[PDB]
Design a binder for this molecule. Structure first.
Ligand SMILES: [Cl-]
Length: 451
């Protein structure tokens, strides 16, 4: 005899039709959806469709490569601007790689099926990618599938799960604690703890570690190397920023979620600048994705989501919305049309389509500052639109006095490329380049002309 197992996934013809944007949920961990993406790709190739798969992270991309083994899959790095084979091939790349290629090449294929995994990702490049994809679909040039449990527009913090979740509302430490939270450390299972910042995570992680807990920390910059370690069993806590809202699959029994985040906001009273506001409450969708780390396994029925406070849905002042438009406005198309945001996300900005469009060398510098310089979209836009070349780092030193960067109450002083010692004092302030120690380290590297 045998077990039935997951049955063959017969694909809806509708999902391949041009002008169709399908939203679906893979419900990972159940686990009864292993055959879905493979089947979609198989049927796409049967129909001779030019197919693109977009993963949120390199990690997820690699897991896809394994899942799709035996199919003509080709991973695409952002180090290459285009890669055209004479052959039937499915391109696989990160959200950001797609947007980067659209900004940097005239040779981006006319994909007529586009699959975006974790399509809720609200990083500017992901938002822009959705805008471009939805525009191509509405043009009748493509069909697309957005895969996510929380499609843009969703406002449900407590959505369906594969397995019962116990939603527990109680006070959660925002920093190191001495007593009064025994439930945190008495818990015998594995916990994923969402924190608003790396700094906050450091404090929490250190406090857990001093009590004998084994802790893995995750952030955007460290996700690539550290996440793989969570696939082993030798940990008690994952302490992570919001990055783990995007496809991270933990074998854990508990989420701890104070429902806090930092939000980049462009201020406009005086010289435009980006601050990191908060901690403030997360959106319902974010809360849902944090909660959604657990309750994935029907055989494990006692998972917990421990949270504090209610979410806040209004995020219209998030810098990512403006930054999305800065990317979109600089993506061209042979039709001569500037791509607009995905429908549900249009209400997030009152920017006029095309207003951030740059021309010629300024556009190229814009892209280089983001790719090679690893600068935020907003900051890259300000520098590029000022007519500054990539290699010209004078602007890092010629800002007003109030723009002086501090570290430990000390005024930061660095070498220029030419070998002069100057105060770090950028013409444009973006908190995302100096707030976190590691971010400031990288920005100092940039200012000194070392990349
Ligand atoms: Cl992060």
């Amino acid at each position: 005899g045998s077990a039935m197992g997951e049955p063959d996934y017969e694909v809806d013809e509708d999902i391949f039709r041009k002008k169709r944007l399908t939203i679906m949920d893979l419900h990972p961990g159940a686990g009864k959806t292993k055959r879905i993406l493979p089947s979609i790709v198989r049927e796409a190739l049967l129909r001779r469709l030019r197919t693109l798969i977009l993963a949120p992270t390199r990690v997820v991309a690699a897991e896809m490569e394994e899942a799709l083994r035996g199919l003509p899959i080709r991973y695409q790095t952002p180090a290459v601007k285009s890669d055209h084979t004479g052959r039937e091939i499915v391109d696989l790349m990160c959200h950001a790689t797609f947007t980067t290629r659209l900004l940097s090449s005239t040779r981006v294929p006319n994909y007529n099926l586009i699959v975006m995994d974790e399509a809720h990702f609200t990083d500017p490049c992901s938002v822009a990618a959705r805008g471009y994809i939805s525009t191509r679909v509405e043009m009748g040039e493509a069909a697309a599938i957005f895969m996510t449990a929380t499609p843009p527009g969703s406002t449900d913090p407590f959505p369906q799960s594969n397995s019962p979740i116990e939603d527990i509302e109680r006070e959660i430490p925002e920093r190191s604690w001495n007593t009064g939270f025994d439930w945190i450390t008495d818990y015998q299972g594995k916990t994923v703890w969402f924190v608003p910042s790396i700094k906050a995570g450091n404090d929490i992680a250190n406090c857990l570690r001093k009590s004998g807990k084994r802790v893995i920390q995750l952030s955007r910059k460290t996700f690539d190397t550290e996440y793989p370690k969570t696939k082993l069993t030798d940990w008690d806590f994952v302490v992570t920023t919001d990055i783990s809202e995007m496809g991270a699959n933990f074998r854990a029994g508990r989420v701890i979620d104070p429902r806090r985040c930092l939000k980049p906001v462009i201020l406009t009273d005086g010289p435009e600048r980006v601050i990191l506001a908060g901690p403030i409450p997360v959106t319902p969708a974010s809360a849902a994705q944090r909660r959604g780390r657990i309750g994935r396994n029907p055989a494990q029925e006692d998972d917990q989501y421990v949270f504090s406070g209610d979410p806040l849905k209004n995020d219209e002042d998030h810098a990512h919305w403006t930054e999305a438009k800065m990317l979109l406005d600089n993506i061209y198309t042979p039709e001569g049309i500037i791509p607009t945001l995905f429908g549900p996300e249009r209400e997030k900005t009152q920017a006029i389509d095309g207003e951030f469009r740059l021309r010629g060398e300024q556009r190229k510098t814009f892209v280089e500052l983001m790719r090679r310089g690893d600068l935020p979209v907003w900051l890259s836009y300000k520098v590029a639109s000022a007519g500054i070349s990539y290699k010209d780092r004078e602007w890092c030193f010629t800002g007003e006095r109030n723009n002086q960067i501090l570290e430990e109450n000390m005024e930061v002083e660095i070498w220029t490329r030419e070998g002069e010692k100057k105060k770090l004092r950028p013409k444009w302030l973006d908190a995302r380049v100096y707030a976190d120690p590691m971010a400031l380290k990288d920005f100092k590297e940039f200012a000194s002309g070392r990349k």
